[PDB]
Write an enzyme that holds these catalytic residues in place. Structure first.
Site, PDB file in Angstrom:
ATOM      1  CG  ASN A   1     -45.261 -48.964  37.747  1.00  0.00           C
ATOM      2  OD1 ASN A   1     -45.704 -49.230  38.348  1.00  0.00           O
ATOM      3  ND2 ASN A   1     -44.714 -49.645  36.282  1.00  0.00           N
TER       4      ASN A   1
ATOM      5  CB  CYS B   1     -46.115 -58.341  32.286  1.00  0.00           C
ATOM      6  SG  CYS B   1     -47.363 -58.028  33.743  1.00  0.00           S
TER       7      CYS B   1
ATOM      8  CB  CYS C   1     -36.069 -19.877  45.774  1.00  0.00           C
ATOM      9  SG  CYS C   1     -37.108 -21.433  45.870  1.00  0.00           S
TER      10      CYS C   1
ATOM     11  N   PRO D   1     -38.170 -53.292  42.223  1.00  0.00           N
ATOM     12  CG  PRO D   1     -36.861 -53.616  44.116  1.00  0.00           C
ATOM     13  CD  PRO D   1     -36.820 -52.735  43.033  1.00  0.00           C
ATOM     14  CG  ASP D   2     -45.197 -54.733  43.879  1.00  0.00           C
ATOM     15  OD1 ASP D   2     -45.452 -53.489  44.128  1.00  0.00           O
ATOM     16  OD2 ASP D   2     -46.055 -55.728  43.952  1.00  0.00           O
ATOM     17  CG  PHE D   3     -40.938 -50.074  45.985  1.00  0.00           C
ATOM     18  CD1 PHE D   3     -39.631 -50.355  46.383  1.00  0.00           C
ATOM     19  CD2 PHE D   3     -40.698 -49.409  44.718  1.00  0.00           C
ATOM     20  CE1 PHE D   3     -38.541 -50.192  45.737  1.00  0.00           C
ATOM     21  CE2 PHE D   3     -39.608 -49.255  43.921  1.00  0.00           C
ATOM     22  CZ  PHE D   3     -38.473 -49.644  44.479  1.00  0.00           C
ATOM     23  NE  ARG D   4     -50.099 -51.054  47.577  1.00  0.00           N
ATOM     24  CZ  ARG D   4     -50.772 -52.128  47.228  1.00  0.00           C
ATOM     25  NH1 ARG D   4     -50.544 -52.797  45.844  1.00  0.00           N
ATOM     26  NH2 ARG D   4     -51.574 -52.429  47.908  1.00  0.00           N
TER      27      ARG D   4
ATOM     28  CG  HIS E   1     -49.288 -43.795  41.939  1.00  0.00           C
ATOM     29  ND1 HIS E   1     -49.008 -45.063  42.600  1.00  0.00           N
ATOM     30  CD2 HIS E   1     -50.847 -43.616  41.982  1.00  0.00           C
ATOM     31  CE1 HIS E   1     -50.419 -45.581  42.706  1.00  0.00           C
ATOM     32  NE2 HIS E   1     -51.195 -44.706  42.367  1.00  0.00           N
TER      33      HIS E   1
ATOM     34  CB  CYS F   1     -39.562 -20.933  42.933  1.00  0.00           C
ATOM     35  SG  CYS F   1     -38.048 -21.261  42.100  1.00  0.00           S
TER      36      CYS F   1
ATOM     37  CG  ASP G   1     -40.543 -47.782  36.903  1.00  0.00           C
ATOM     38  OD1 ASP G   1     -40.622 -47.201  35.583  1.00  0.00           O
ATOM     39  OD2 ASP G   1     -41.204 -48.959  37.252  1.00  0.00           O
TER      40      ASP G   1
ATOM     41  CB  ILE H   1     -45.325 -53.550  33.591  1.00  0.00           C
ATOM     42  CG1 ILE H   1     -45.116 -52.334  33.692  1.00  0.00           C
ATOM     43  CG2 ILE H   1     -46.726 -54.049  33.490  1.00  0.00           C
ATOM     44  CD1 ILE H   1     -45.132 -51.234  32.674  1.00  0.00           C
TER      45      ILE H   1
HETATM   46  C1  LIG Z   1     -37.828 -46.721  42.241  1.00  0.00           C
HETATM   47  C2  LIG Z   1     -36.880 -45.411  42.086  1.00  0.00           C
HETATM   48  C3  LIG Z   1     -36.684 -44.871  40.889  1.00  0.00           C
HETATM   49  F1  LIG Z   1     -37.536 -45.391  39.822  1.00  0.00           F
HETATM   50  C4  LIG Z   1     -35.934 -43.787  40.781  1.00  0.00           C
HETATM   51  C5  LIG Z   1     -35.051 -43.233  41.609  1.00  0.00           C
HETATM   52  C6  LIG Z   1     -34.995 -43.951  42.868  1.00  0.00           C
HETATM   53  C7  LIG Z   1     -35.879 -45.125  43.177  1.00  0.00           C
HETATM   54  C8  LIG Z   1     -35.954 -45.787  44.642  1.00  0.00           C
HETATM   55  N1  LIG Z   1     -37.329 -45.217  45.117  1.00  0.00           N
HETATM   56  C9  LIG Z   1     -37.309 -43.541  45.388  1.00  0.00           C
HETATM   57  C10 LIG Z   1     -38.717 -43.195  46.140  1.00  0.00           C
HETATM   58  C11 LIG Z   1     -39.189 -44.003  47.311  1.00  0.00           C
HETATM   59  C12 LIG Z   1     -39.046 -45.567  47.104  1.00  0.00           C
HETATM   60  C13 LIG Z   1     -39.995 -46.134  45.960  1.00  0.00           C
HETATM   61  C14 LIG Z   1     -41.306 -46.071  46.691  1.00  0.00           C
HETATM   62  N2  LIG Z   1     -42.148 -44.879  46.499  1.00  0.00           N
HETATM   63  C15 LIG Z   1     -43.421 -45.177  47.479  1.00  0.00           C
HETATM   64  C16 LIG Z   1     -44.579 -44.354  47.401  1.00  0.00           C
HETATM   65  C17 LIG Z   1     -44.451 -43.233  46.603  1.00  0.00           C
HETATM   66  C18 LIG Z   1     -45.698 -42.601  46.595  1.00  0.00           C
HETATM   67  C19 LIG Z   1     -46.800 -42.971  47.153  1.00  0.00           C
HETATM   68  N3  LIG Z   1     -48.056 -42.345  47.346  1.00  0.00           N
HETATM   69  C20 LIG Z   1     -49.337 -42.885  47.147  1.00  0.00           C
HETATM   70  O1  LIG Z   1     -49.550 -44.115  47.298  1.00  0.00           O
HETATM   71  C21 LIG Z   1     -50.207 -41.899  47.197  1.00  0.00           C
HETATM   72  C22 LIG Z   1     -50.374 -40.466  47.646  1.00  0.00           C
HETATM   73  C23 LIG Z   1     -51.617 -39.635  47.624  1.00  0.00           C
HETATM   74  C24 LIG Z   1     -52.476 -40.287  47.190  1.00  0.00           C
HETATM   75 CL1  LIG Z   1     -53.996 -39.087  47.125  1.00  0.00          CL
HETATM   76  C25 LIG Z   1     -52.745 -41.531  46.713  1.00  0.00           C
HETATM   77  C26 LIG Z   1     -51.596 -42.150  46.720  1.00  0.00           C
HETATM   78  C27 LIG Z   1     -46.832 -44.240  47.959  1.00  0.00           C
HETATM   79  C28 LIG Z   1     -45.512 -45.018  48.012  1.00  0.00           C
HETATM   80  N4  LIG Z   1     -43.075 -46.304  48.041  1.00  0.00           N
HETATM   81  O2  LIG Z   1     -41.733 -46.918  47.667  1.00  0.00           O
HETATM   82  C29 LIG Z   1     -37.442 -45.922  46.486  1.00  0.00           C
HETATM   83 ZN   LIG Z   2     -37.051 -22.364  43.880  1.00  0.00          ZN
END
Ligand SMILES: Cc1c(F)cccc1CN1CCC[C@@H](Cc2nc(-c3ccc(NC(=O)c4ccc(Cl)cc4)cc3)no2)C1
Ligand SMILES: [Zn+2]
Length: 295
Positions: free
Chosen positions: A113, A264, A169, A39-42, A132, A145, A115, A32
Site C-alpha cells: 500500500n 481483516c 532547482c 479503495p482497492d485501486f485494483r 510499491h 538534487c 496510503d 487492510i
Molecule cells: C490513495 C492516496 C493516498 F494514500 C495519498 C494521497 C493520494 C491518494 C490518491 N491516489 C494517488 C496516487 C494515484 C491513485 C492511487 C493509485 N496508485 C496506483 C499505482 C501506483 C503505482 C503502481 N506501480 C506498480 O504497480 C509497479 C511499478 C513498477 C514495478 Cl517494477 C512494479 C509495480 C501501480 C498503480 N494505482 O492507483 C490515487
Molecule cells: Zn531539486
C-alpha cells in the site's frame, strides 16, 4: 511433525504464545485499508482507469508511467486530487501490527500500500518495506538534487492545482510511489534476503497474492514457518494452469498454512482476543482514532 498443534486460528494463537514464536513478518495489501475508506485501486468496483479520456493518454497506464509523468505530470496530479483520501485513519489491522511492534514480535511489515497508514499507526521506517513506495514522502526528480518534501507540502500543491516544483532547482517533485518504468526499491530485495532467515510466523493480511514479486514472498519462508492468511478470500494456492511453495490449507498434506476468511479487522480482532490483547487493542485504536478525529 509440525509447529502448529492444529490448523486453526486457535492453533496460531497458541503457537504465538509459545517460546518458538519470536519473530513475525507481516505481508499486507489493499484489503487492510478498505475499511479506512481507501479503495482497492485494483478491484473493478473502483474503476480507476475510467474518465481518463480528457488526458489523451497514449494508453491508460501512462498516468502511472515515469516517462509520461516527467513530460506531462498534470494528469497524475489531477487524479491524485480527485482521489485524495478525506482522512488518514488506520484500521484495527494497522494497530494490530503496532501491538506486535510494542510486544517486540514484529520483525518487518512488507506492504503493497501507498496510503501511509502503517506509518500513522506507529510503524517506523526501520519496520517497513514499502514495496510499491509511499505518498508519505516526495522527492525532486533531478538526480543531482533529490530534495525531499513531506506530504503536507505535496498536499498543498495538489489541492491548489499547482504542479509541484522543487524550491532548489525547479524540477518536478514526485511522490515516492514506484511508477511503471521504475524498479522496486532495493530495500525490498535486501530485506527479503535477511528477514526470511529469521522469521517464525508469516501473517498475510488483505492481499490476494497475485502481484509479483510481492506474492513470491510467501515461498521465501522456511519450510517449518506457519503462515496465516487473514483475507476475505482464500489466496496463495498453486495455480493448476501453470503446472511450489504455494499455500496448502486444505489437503491431507497440509501442515502449516491457515486461512481465516472474513474482513481483516474482524480477523485481527479475533486473533487479538485469543491472545488476551483485545482490551489493549481497543484502547490503542480508540485513543489513536480520537486523536486523529480531533486534528
Ligand atoms: C490513495 C492516496 C493516498 F494514500 C495519498 C494521497 C493520494 C491518494 C490518491 N491516489 C494517488 C496516487 C494515484 C491513485 C492511487 C493509485 N496508485 C496506483 C499505482 C501506483 C503505482 C503502481 N506501480 C506498480 O504497480 C509497479 C511499478 C513498477 C514495478 Cl517494477 C512494479 C509495480 C501501480 C498503480 N494505482 O492507483 C490515487
Ligand atoms: Zn531539486
Amino acid at each position: 511433525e509440525r509447529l502448529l498443534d492444529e490448523l486453526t486460528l486457535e492453533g496460531v494463537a497458541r503457537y504465538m504464545q509459545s517460546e518458538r514464536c519470536r519473530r513475525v513478518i507481516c505481508l499486507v495489501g489493499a484489503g487492510i485499508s478498505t475499511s479506512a475508506g481507501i479503495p482497492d485501486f485494483r478491484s473493478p468496483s473502483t474503476g480507476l482507469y475510467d474518465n481518463l479520456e480528457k488526458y489523451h493518454l497514449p494508453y491508460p497506464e501512462a498516468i502511472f508511467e515515469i516517462s509520461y509523468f516527467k513530460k506531462h505530470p498534470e494528469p497524475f496530479f489531477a487524479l491524485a486530487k480527485e482521489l485524495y483520501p478525506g482522512q488518514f485513519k488506520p484500521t484495527i489491522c494497522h494497530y494490530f501490527m503496532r501491538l506486535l511492534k510494542d510486544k517486540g514480535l514484529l520483525l518487518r511489515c512488507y506492504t503493497q500500500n501507498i496510503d501511509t497508514l502503517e506509518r500513522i499507526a506507529g510503524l517506523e521506517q526501520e519496520d517497513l518495506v514499502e514495496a510499491h513506495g509511499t505518498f508519505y514522502t516526495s522527492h525532486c526528480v533531478s538526480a543531482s538534487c533529490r530534495h525531499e518534501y513531506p506530504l503536507s507540502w505535496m498536499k498543498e500543491k495538489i489541492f491548489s492545482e499547482v504542479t509541484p516544483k522543487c524550491e532548489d532547482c525547479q524540477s518536478l517533485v514526485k511522490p515516492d510511489i514506484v511508477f511503471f518504468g521504475e524498479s522496486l526499491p532495493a530495500r525490498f530485495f535486501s530485506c527479503m534476503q535477511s528477514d526470511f532467515l529469521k522469521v517464525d510466523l508469516l501473517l498475510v493480511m488483505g492481499t490476494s497474492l497475485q502481484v509479483q514479486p510481492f506474492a513470491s514472498l510467501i515461498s521465501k519462508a522456511p519450510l517449518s514457518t506457519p503462515r496465516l492468511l487473514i483475507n476475505k478470500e482464500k489466496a496463495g494456492q498453486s495455480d493448476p494452469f501453470l503446472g511450489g511453495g504455494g499455500m496448502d490449507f486444505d489437503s491431507k498434506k497440509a501442515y502449516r498454512d491457515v486461512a481465516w476468511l472474513g474482513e481483516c479487522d474482524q480477523g485481527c480482532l479475533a486473533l487479538a482476543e485469543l491472545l488476551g490483547w483485545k482490551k489493549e487493542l481497543e484502547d490503542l485504536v480508540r485513543r489513536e482514532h480520537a486523536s486523529i478525529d480531533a486534528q
